[PDB]
């Protein structure tokens, strides 16, 4: 028995605007309204990175978004989610995730005009495939639209009212692009390594189809999360990443000189650390 008006009215009295915990969330910048498209509607970004799935009560957030969306869901507006880096750790459950179909006035899902998802990856393909049974509203739907380069953007969204995570514009420049590489696992298909100043991006060269449409998956290793770098041969490279499970092999003609690249990344981020020694080892 719970429905969009109870759960209002339960936030109200049971008051959360001294929690403490609840304004910490306006800080942490995880959802907030930013310019306009140009059909003229408001945007809102929902930061997709920064909900540790264990850390904070879950209806905080629901409450959260509501909240900032009140004066403006009575008419159309538009949503943009960012999904860079985004990993198991910051994932819903069920019990949680069936709760955003439910908390709503009927009409705010309605007025939802178009959303533009970005910065896809392999982890949340897979994460919509074991939930296919509860996104089935989802599927096939004309509001999503998938971007595949922030270039595509600014035909929805016009530049200079584009206002995305300052940490994501800076995974856009002093790229260093290996065009035409190949990706070796159980079933192989083309990727382009692209080796920043601060991490590593495995942009994926082949369109997939994710909720029914076709889209490119690009993923993203940081240098703490990068172990082991190592030279099997040039025709090949294996790197290993932290909780991982299995590390990754990739097949180029110049291994080597990609192998270097990645080094220097995780050699200046060995010596930017502060702390001596970690003390002990994780064993699993
Ligand atoms: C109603 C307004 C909702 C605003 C939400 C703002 C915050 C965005 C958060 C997005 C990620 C977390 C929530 C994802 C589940 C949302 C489910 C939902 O509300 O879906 C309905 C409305 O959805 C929308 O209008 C916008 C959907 C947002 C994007 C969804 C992306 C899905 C792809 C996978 C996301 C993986 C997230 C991983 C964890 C962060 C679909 O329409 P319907 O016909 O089924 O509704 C009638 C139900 N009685």
Not at 5 to 29: D, G, N, P, W, Y
Not at 220 to 236: F, G, R
Not at 248 to 275: G, K, N, Y
Request: hydrophobic share 35%; net charge neutral.
């Amino acid at each position: 028995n719970l429905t969009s008006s109870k759960f209002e009215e339960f936030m109200t009295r049971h008051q959360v605007h001294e929690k403490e915990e609840f304004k910490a969330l306006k800080t942490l910048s995880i959802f907030y309204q930013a310019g306009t498209s140009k059909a003229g509607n408001p945007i809102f970004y929902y930061v997709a990175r920064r909900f540790k799935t264990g850390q904070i009560n879950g209806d905080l957030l629901i409450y959260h978004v509501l909240l900032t969306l009140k004066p403006y869901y009575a008419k159309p507006y538009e949503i943009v989610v960012d999904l860079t880096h985004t990993g198991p750790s910051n994932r819903f459950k069920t019990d949680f995730l069936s709760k955003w179909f439910v908390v709503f006035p009927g009409f705010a899902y309605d007025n939802v005009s178009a959303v533009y998802i970005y910065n896809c990856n392999s982890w949340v393909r897979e994460y919509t495939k074991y939930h296919e049974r509860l996104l089935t509203g989802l599927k096939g739907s004309k509001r999503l639209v998938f971007i595949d380069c922030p270039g595509k953007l600014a035909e929805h969204i016009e530049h200079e009212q584009q206002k995305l995570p300052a940490a994501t514009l800076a995974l856009e420049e002093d790229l260093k692009v290996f065009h035409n590489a190949l990706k070796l696992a159980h079933k192989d298909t083309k990727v382009s390594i692209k080796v920043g100043s601060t991490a590593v991006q495995v942009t994926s060269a082949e369109r997939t189809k994710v909720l029914g449409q076709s889209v490119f998956l690009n993923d993203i290793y940081y240098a703490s999360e990068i172990e082991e770098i190592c030279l099997v041969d040039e025709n090949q490279f294996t790197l290993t990443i932290a909780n991982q499970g299995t590390p990754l092999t990739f097949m180029h003609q110049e291994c080597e000189a990609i192998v270097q690249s990645i080094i220097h990344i995780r050699t200046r981020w060995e010596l930017s650390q502060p702390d001596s020694i970690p003390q002990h080892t994780k064993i699993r």
